[PDB]
């Protein structure tokens, strides 16, 4: 399983 | 050897050309680069919202003067609120300036007001790879293999600038009216001539050195190239959990598991780009970009032909006419409210 939606991207991880 | 002499000799002179190209490309970018359209709110109607993300909005817009539409980028400044958040703003803005690429969004005009940061691009009225992949599933090779053709020459080229990309995906790749693609959203590029240290990107699609907290370079876009033609071939990417910290633990593990539709040669491009060690990893070698462009799985593919948009699409969008959003998904249609006072105005001050 994982994600099939529109992934955020991440400015700061 | 694998080519003959007619062949070898070929594939040299379009390197070469290839080399004399980027010279020039690089000569008409930093005239750009060093010297820099502007607009205003009211000159635009608002038509729909395309898209939404954590900084603000995606919206079709419609020029008054000219009735041309556009896809105007609101980016709320009280949203901009960590550092690496602004200086990326600024990234995204003054590269979109001064680039020039067929599979590259083209930046129209840029202003901000009291509260909100705007770029105008051209409206790519295709949609989302995104979605067009969701809804078929997985694209076949060859189709996979002109958009990603595509893909490697806009690295070529920004790569050869010193510009490094660092948010592919199928997201921010749109289809055109010729079902070429657009790459937009520019606010994880960054002009870098070695290394740097942001933690920045989309889960999925980090490289395993930017997950570890490691400087590092240009590599990270071949590695996301791997992930997105896997992504394309599949309909999933390779490194696939429900959470972050779970897509993070697969990717610095070294192991990819490939369908068993996958040709051969797809399955060692891959490898070789899914690559953790970097001595290793196709596009980081002392052949640099040929690694990728000669690979047995491109060998069908004619890249000047691609550059010229001659080859024929997978696909043509429908397009009903101007201003058409079809192939868009919709959103919550939310209010844009410029405050009467001016918001963070300092940070601010070079966009
Ligand atoms: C939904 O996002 C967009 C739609 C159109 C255009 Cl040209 C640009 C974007 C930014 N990715
Ligand atoms: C999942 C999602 C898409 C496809 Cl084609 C296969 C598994």
Redesign the pocket.
């Known amino acids: 399983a994982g994600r099939t939606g529109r992934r955020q991207a991440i400015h700061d991880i | 050897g694998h080519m003959g002499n007619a062949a070898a000799a070929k594939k040299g002179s379009e390197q070469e050309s290839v080399k004399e190209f980027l010279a020039k490309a690089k000569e008409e970018f930093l005239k750009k680069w060093e010297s820099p359209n502007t607009a205003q709110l009211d000159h635009f109607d608002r038509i729909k919202t395309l898209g939404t993300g954590s900084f603000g909005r995606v919206m079709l817009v419609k020029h008054k003067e000219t009735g041309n539409h556009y896809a105007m980028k609101i980016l709320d400044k009280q949203k901009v609120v960590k550092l690496k958040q602004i200086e990326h703003t600024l990234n995204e803005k003054r590269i979109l300036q001064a680039v020039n690429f067929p599979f590259l969004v083209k930046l129209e005009f840029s202003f901000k007001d009291n509260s909100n940061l705007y770029m105008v691009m051209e409206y790519v009225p295709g949609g989302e790879m995104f979605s067009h992949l969701r809804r078929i599933?997985?694209f076949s090779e060859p189709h996979a293999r002109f958009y990603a053709a595509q893909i490697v020459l806009t690295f070529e080229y920004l790569h050869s600038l010193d510009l490094i990309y660092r948010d592919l995906k199928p997201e921010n790749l749109l289809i055109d009216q010729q079902g070429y693609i657009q790459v937009t959203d520019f606010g994880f590029a960054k002009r870098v001539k070695g290394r740097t240290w942001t933690l920045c990107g989309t889960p999925e699609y980090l490289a395993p050195e930017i997950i570890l907290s490691k400087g590092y370079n240009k590599a990270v876009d071949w590695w996301a190239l791997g992930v997105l033609i896997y992504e394309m071939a599949?309909?999933?990417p390779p490194f696939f959990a429900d959470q972050p910290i779970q897509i993070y633990e697969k990717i610095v593990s070294g192991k990819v598991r490939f369908p068993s539709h996958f040709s051969s040669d797809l399955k060692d491009l891959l490898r070789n780009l899914l690559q953790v060690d970097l001595t290793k990893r196709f596009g980081n070698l002392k052949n640099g970009v040929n690694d990728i462009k000669n690979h047995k799985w491109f060998a069908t593919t004619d890249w000047i032909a691609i550059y010229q948009r001659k080859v024929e699409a997978p696909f043509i969008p429908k397009f009903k006419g101007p201003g058409d959003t079809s192939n868009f998904d919709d959103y919550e249609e939310e209010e844009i409210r410029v405050s009467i006072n001016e918001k963070c105005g300092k940070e601010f001050t070079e966009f």
């Open positions: 599933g997985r599949a309909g999933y």
